[PDB]
Amino acid sequence: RRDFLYHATAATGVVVTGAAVWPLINQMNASADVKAMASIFVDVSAVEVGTQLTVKWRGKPVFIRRRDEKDIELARSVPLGALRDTSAENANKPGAEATDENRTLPAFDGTNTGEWLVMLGVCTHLGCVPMGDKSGDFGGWFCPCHGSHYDSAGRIRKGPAPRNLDIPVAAFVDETTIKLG
Amino acid sequence: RRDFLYHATAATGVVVTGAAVWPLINQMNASADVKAMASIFVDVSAVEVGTQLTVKWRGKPVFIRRRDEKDIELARSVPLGALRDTSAENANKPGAEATDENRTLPAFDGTNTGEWLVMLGVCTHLGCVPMGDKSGDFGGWFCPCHGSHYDSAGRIRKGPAPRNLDIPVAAFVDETTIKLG
Amino acid sequence: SGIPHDHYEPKTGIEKWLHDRLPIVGLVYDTIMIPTPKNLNWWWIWGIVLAFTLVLQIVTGIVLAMHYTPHVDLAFASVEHIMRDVNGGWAMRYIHANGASLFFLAVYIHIFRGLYYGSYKAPREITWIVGMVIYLLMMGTAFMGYVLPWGQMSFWGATVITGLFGAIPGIGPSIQAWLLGGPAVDNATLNRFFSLHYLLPFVIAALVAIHIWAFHTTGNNNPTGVEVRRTAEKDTLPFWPYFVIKDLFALALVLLGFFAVVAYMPNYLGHPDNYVQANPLSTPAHIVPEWYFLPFYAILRAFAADVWVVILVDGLTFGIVDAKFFGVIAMFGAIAVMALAPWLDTSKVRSGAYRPKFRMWFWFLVLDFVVLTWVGAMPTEYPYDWISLIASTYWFAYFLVILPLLGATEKPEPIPASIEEDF
Amino acid sequence: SGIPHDHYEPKTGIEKWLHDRLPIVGLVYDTIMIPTPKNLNWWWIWGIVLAFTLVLQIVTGIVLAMHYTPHVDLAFASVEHIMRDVNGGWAMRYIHANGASLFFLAVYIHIFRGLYYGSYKAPREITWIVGMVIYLLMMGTAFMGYVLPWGQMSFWGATVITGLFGAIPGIGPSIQAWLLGGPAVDNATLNRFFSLHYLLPFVIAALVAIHIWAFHTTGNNNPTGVEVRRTAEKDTLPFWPYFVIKDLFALALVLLGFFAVVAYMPNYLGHPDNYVQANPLSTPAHIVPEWYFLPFYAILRAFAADVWVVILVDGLTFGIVDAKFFGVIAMFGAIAVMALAPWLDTSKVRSGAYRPKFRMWFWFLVLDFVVLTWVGAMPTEYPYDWISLIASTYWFAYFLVILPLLGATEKPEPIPASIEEDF
Amino acid sequence: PDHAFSFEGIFGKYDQAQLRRGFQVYNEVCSACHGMKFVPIRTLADDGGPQLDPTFVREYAAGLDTIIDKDSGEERDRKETDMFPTRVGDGMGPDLSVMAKARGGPEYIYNYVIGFEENPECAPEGIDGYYYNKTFQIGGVPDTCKDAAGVKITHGSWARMPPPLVDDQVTYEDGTPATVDQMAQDVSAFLMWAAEPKLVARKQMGLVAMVMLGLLSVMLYLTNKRLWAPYKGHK
Amino acid sequence: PDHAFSFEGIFGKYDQAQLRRGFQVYNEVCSACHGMKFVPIRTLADDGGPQLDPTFVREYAAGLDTIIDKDSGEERDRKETDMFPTRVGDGMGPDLSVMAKARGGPEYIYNYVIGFEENPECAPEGIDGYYYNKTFQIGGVPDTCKDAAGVKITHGSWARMPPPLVDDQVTYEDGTPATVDQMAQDVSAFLMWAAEPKLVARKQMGLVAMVMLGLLSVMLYLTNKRLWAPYKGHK
Ligand code: HEC
Ligand code: HEC
Ligand code: HEC
Ligand code: HEC
Ligand code: HEC
Ligand code: HEC
Ligand code: FES
Ligand code: FES
């Protein structure tokens, strides 16, 4: 029939066109050489605890910074109230409250948390690198792209950045190493 | 006047157009990163005449070797007969016979030829680098890629290599220098 | 009326055998002897400026691409190879880089000329639509291009102006990764941008093709709310040679100033930090993307829930429309509303030379544009936040409410007849 | 006669407000409902094939350029990155590489269809000129492109097909150096070729624009020596939907065969030596540039002063016209004479379906083309030299002398009237 | 007869046990001189070929040579993301990444590895440092074996590679007679993988496309026959 | 006053003696830590700047560090065609190729090299391993010198570079008082050369183009005034 045959030819043409177009839009997706996206062993190795440590990975920096008591007490003295993001972005654990006890890090294979904190050095606003070394209006990190003030533990404050600095999955290698991935 | 003014405006437009076009045709010419390549010099400067001298250029080595009497006499005692390539590949002169008098080199700006010989250290078979320092079955160069025996003056012998070792265009710089290009 | 004067191909045998391919018919009848009014001021030149600038950019780029190598390890080096070894080098690069500046400066005056003399008003909607489409294409182009030198500002500008697409929910990260070629910026992004950057200009030329086709079919706007009175039209001198020569004179002046800049003040409009190689591990202070995107950058980074007029706390009613998404929508709307204008101005009138209130509001709009330009560079600390909020609010207010109210109660002026204004 | 049927924009308000930009008027009146005769065989499809192939090549290339890195040290590696990592990879490359083959195959049939049915005869000269211009552009394009992989055949093909320009005296070496970016081949040549290779296709599209404009203004040839009898023309059905569907059917078949090749016989038309990296120090045996340049390669390397019909010993009268220059002139002339044809055939007649002697000579010409194709690959040793000389001589003889003699004494046939051939 | 492989045809998606055997052979024999830079190690887990266990891949990678770095010069642990090593000179050979395409290809490798017999009865002395092959055609030939105009009278020529394998060079874990011929076939298939890993996807795409386009073409033929009916009915 | 250079204006084609002095200092002082990879050694003969004698250039090149190769790993002779060396880490600094543009530029270098005075009377102890500079603004500051909201009360900050020169560090062959200020000016000019070598050509092109375009524009103005005369005469 007129209608059936004509419309079916059109439908088949459309289907073939789409099957030909899809790969032109698929090739731009992540290739296999980008699929890898594996881990990294960074050795703390006497980093002069208290200043900072940065390492490249996945194309972004991974901040490994020891803790300075004044920085710590400022951290542990932050009630969940008045905290923009209270989710503790760290993916090594569940959505537990953004508390310093959970938010600092694993305990060297021992039992302590208020001494090391390794987070992803990527501002959640649009992905800039905040400046460290005690900066901003909260004694933490300051993003120069738009002015986002981070706190000691990395939770976002005073700016457009919606959430704190995430924490990748990482465990220790028996007191001198870090495993990123 | 009508004619003068109109034609002069047209002429000025044309002149400006040409002054703007010329560089468009100039950028395609040799950039500065390439000029420093056409002209390369090699300061011989007491190379302990008789062993060898090699220098990189154009991505291939340029062999500058002094002459050892035994090597010389073996050279000058080679009749054109039984010589695979009798063309004297050297491009600093015409297709004159591959004779040692023409095949050795210019004469320091003086008058002598049986003392220096600079050829392109590239086997004519497929472009390997023959080993020097008196090697092979003819007291010259030996190609390890397929076994081509070169002679004292560089003429091919005993192998698949069809022709001898070419000689680039080179002149002297008054008794201590060589100009390659 | 609309005298095309096809020339009837009566010249000679050459002009008679050309009846195979009409081409000269087109040129003569339409694109050279196009009747244009006499009442044209010096604001109707910038289109010639834009066409010439586009040709210039295309040419210089085709030349640079003969020496630029798209790769993280060889881009900077190739740029220096250009500025040092190549014969002309610095000229091509400075002419390419700065000419973009002139291009955008010229489109700004081209656009604001339009808003004044009702060039968006009917029957000239298609031209406006095509022009906004172009503006978008050329913004994207310049963005893709600022990245190629792989300096320091390149990296971070790309980072943020791609995190935008990732702000939105559900389909943000996917688009981000599909655009960057990966999670973050690297050589893949560079290749995409180079290709794309080397392709869109031709689309722009075609769109310019339609841009020129439209306003030849539709008469050029004129300082007055009047048409060429087709019904024989003693007004409306032709384009060639009169307006051609006028535009070429202005263009010569503009190129004179442009080359003076190129030769004495070339690094003025640039960011020095783009002369240091990239470090994904260190961000400089005051990225300040560029100067032709500061308005929208400010409209973006203004809404942050930091004012009593903060509509973000109210938009939080829906848990999905956070701040970032709100700013992105605000920017896209800042442009979409400018595109929608011709269907918002409810006035059966024309050029604001006979609408005073419109004059005042329009000059306030120009001032707002300049202010936004100056604010995108300054931090988000008090008082600049209030300023940016006020300016964005006025932009939206103008384009949404102000024009209807005028179209209602804005006719205290005697309109001029007889486009032949022999004053 | 020549019914354009502009549609009068009577559809509705949408088709009436489109009086701002005519565009749909153009499409409908001209480029869709273009009266074409009924007498069309299956040889009038290859233009659609060429247009589609051009689009295909442009698209696939724009995709590849997102992963190809023009540099001697990173081209091969990027090509392998494509064929291995990228999602589609091999497809794009094989479709790009082979589609060039189909492109040239299709232009060959497009051209020889033309020589038979007097499509170069008046009043269709402009189409012929434009087509030869295109042919030149696309040859140069394919040449620039075969170089980009920086294999082994790339290098040496470039070397020789650039030494050509250097053969000529006085201005040979200068042009050679200005084209290679230096004395010999290196990255500079690669950048030039990539840019150029990424730019000419658009010029080709424009030229295709004029190509299509011409034969719409000038009626499509038709199997016979007759026109559409404009004065109403019961003959000359429209293009859409009839011929559109016919061409699309043939195109589907052609793409079917093409993809079967791509998927089973992709490396067949290629040279394996292009899969080994380049060595400027070692040349392989039987460079054999490609298969769409062998005719002219043979016409070039035929004249060598090695036959009693050797006109080089006679051209040596002038000490400047040596052999090399003679072969180069012979090739340029092999093309220039094909372009000059329409002013050499002195016949007030048309398609060789009514000119027998012309049929015989034309089939001999096709055979000569095939022979030249087969000879450019075989050495210059006896007997192939005599064969190449004979074939080139016949090519030139046909195009110079044969057509005049026919036009003189070639009308023993009853021409058909009434292009409505209801047989 | 010709000992056709599995992939030689419209089907034959790279029987994988053959490829694992070729891998046992390549890493223990050919790797001593040859390399495959154009080949990432992670491909030993991608489908189509040897779908080995990733952990074994990481182990085998760390057990290879040291590829230093691209940013900070320091001998790393050679992670799978890197490429196979490269043996370059001083008694070494070319790269086998795509040698299966730079020559019907794999049959060349099979009939090359196969064939290193003693020197014939024209030049039994042979050559010092060079060994004889019956199929390589790009090697030197002594003057004693050439004809009157330089052409060789031997089937093959003299190759610089020594005989790679003896009667029972290695053991197969699966259980199989590891004679020279089976090893040659297996390694040829492995190299063909290293060169064309996306073969099976090629064939499946070809099938799908042939089918869809045959369908489209048939439908268009029907449409054409229909439209052109009232004009081709009286004749 | 501001100690303007020669090139600071519409003229000033890089007084070359100043650049030779800056070179004497750069290779003997700054080269110990800094590098200029973006600078070929063959530019010390190109016009515009130091038009030194090529032979001295080849000597000075061969007398530098060893840049190995790109094809065959082997420590060569560091031919001029190569680029200046690179000092990368372990107590070293950035590259000075284009530092004269990544900051009015050279005045930054002058007023930076100029100024390393002792620690002020807010933190006289200072810092261990860091030294104080009047004009660097991107360095750390002790908490004793910061205000109530993190801003520094010092003019400059603490830079990791030590004082590069004393009262009379080197001799000038031409004959000139080699105090610190003259050396600073000279080296600033040398770096500006290394960054903008094609300055003088820039200025000459600008002059030529301004002239030609003024001429063209005047002629077009006359043509316009003429053509538009019969329409602007009665009013
Ligand atoms: C050194 C002891 C080698 C080992 C072990 C293997 N190969 Fe090799 N190979 C080697 C050299 C020096 C050469 C060059 C030979 C020449 O005359 O140029 C080769 C060459 C090959 C080739 C290419 C043959 C050609 O036609 O060019 C192939 C296909 C090849 N070799 C295969 C191969 C395989 C499969 C091996 C492991 C079983 C192997 N070779 C080992 C040096 C050495
Ligand atoms: C090591 C002993 C050095 C020598 C000798 C010189 N420089 Fe240097 N420089 C050095 C370091 C470690 C740094 C980094 C300082 C920091 O705090 O990051 C620098 C920096 C510079 C700069 C950049 C300043 C800036 O604003 O970033 C300049 C312009 C500079 N140095 C100039 C310079 C000159 C001209 C020298 C020779 C006279 C010189 N330096 C020597 C290390 C060392
Ligand atoms: C044929 C290629 C090509 C075309 C067409 C082209 N450019 Fe570019 N563009 C380049 C290259 C190459 C670079 C990098 C070299 C450079 O920065 O000068 C570049 C860089 C840029 C830069 C950064 C300049 C710098 O030095 O940082 C801008 C801005 C830019 N392009 C804008 C544009 C715009 C806007 C257009 C047209 C609408 C355009 N370009 C047309 C090739 C081109
Ligand atoms: C967003 C708006 C917009 C943009 C961007 C734009 N145009 Fe226009 N253009 C207009 C309008 C409106 C007119 C007035 C048409 C009329 O008067 O009929 C116009 C008119 C013109 C004219 C004729 C009269 C004049 O003003 O000179 C030219 C030529 C022209 N444009 C060229 C260009 C070119 C070239 C570009 C870009 C490369 C461009 N325009 C970009 C909207 C735009
Ligand atoms: C947008 C870019 C682009 C366009 C348009 C384009 N190509 Fe290419 N072409 C490439 C790239 C990239 C390569 C190198 C990668 C490759 O060889 O597949 C290439 C390579 C080639 C090759 C060698 C193929 C091979 O694998 O050795 C040929 C032949 C070729 N092009 C011909 C053409 C012709 C003919 C046209 C149109 C008339 C065309 N190309 C259009 C980008 C393009
Ligand atoms: C050197 C000659 C030549 C070349 C090359 C050429 N054409 Fe043509 N083309 C012709 C002639 C002659 C005609 C017949 C015109 C007529 O019958 O009025 C024609 C007709 C056509 C037609 C309409 C009738 C037909 O034969 O299909 C199309 C469509 C077409 N060409 C497209 C193309 C495209 C697309 C290209 C290249 C990408 C191309 N041609 C290359 C000479 C050429
Ligand atoms: S990007 Fe980090 S705050 Fe804007
Ligand atoms: S390559 Fe020199 S002899 Fe074979």
Author numbering:
A (entry chain R), B (entry chain E): 11 to 191
C (entry chain P), D (entry chain C): 2 to 232, 237 to 428
E (entry chain D), F (entry chain Q): 5 to 107, 126 to 257
What does the study report here?
CIII2 is a dimer with each monomer comprised of three subunits: the Rieske FeS (FeS) protein with a [2Fe-2S] cluster, cyt b with hemes bH and bL, and cyt c1 with heme c1 cofactors. The FeS protein external domain (FeS-ED) is mobile between the b (close to heme bL) and c (close to heme c1) positions. In R. capsulatus, both the diffusible cyt c2 and the membrane-anchored cyt cy carry electrons from CIII2 to CIV in respiration. Here we report the cryo-electron microscopic (cryo-EM) structure of this functional bc1-cbb3-type SC (CIII2CIV, at 5.2 Å resolution), together with three structural conformers of native CIII2 (at 3.3–4.2 Å resolution).
When similar analyses were carried out without imposing C2 symmetry, three distinct maps were obtained for CIII2 (CIII2 c-c, CIII2 b-c, and CIII2 b-b at 3.8, 4.2, and 3.5 Å resolutions, respectively). These maps were superimposable with respect to cyt b and cyt c1 subunits, except for the FeS-ED portions. Notably, the third structure (CIII2 b-c) was asymmetric, with the FeS-ED of one monomer being in c and the other one in b positions. Such asymmetric structures of native CIII2 have not been observed frequently, although they are proposed to occur during QH2 oxidation. The third model with one FeS-ED in c and the other in b positions yielded the expected clustering pattern depending on the local FeS-ED conformation. To our knowledge, no native heterodimeric CIII2 structure of bacterial origin with different conformations of its FeS-EDs has been reported. Thus native CIII2 is not always a symmetric homodimer, and the FeS-ED of each monomer is free to move independently from the other. Emerging asymmetric structures of bacterial and mitochondrial native CIII2 obtained by cryo-EM in the absence of inhibitors or mutations, combined with the inter-monomer electron transfer between the hemes bL of the monomers, now provide a glimpse into plausible “heterodimeric Q-cycle” mechanism(s). Accordingly, the FeS-EDs of CIII2 monomers might cycle between homo- and hetero-dimeric conformations during the Q-cycle.
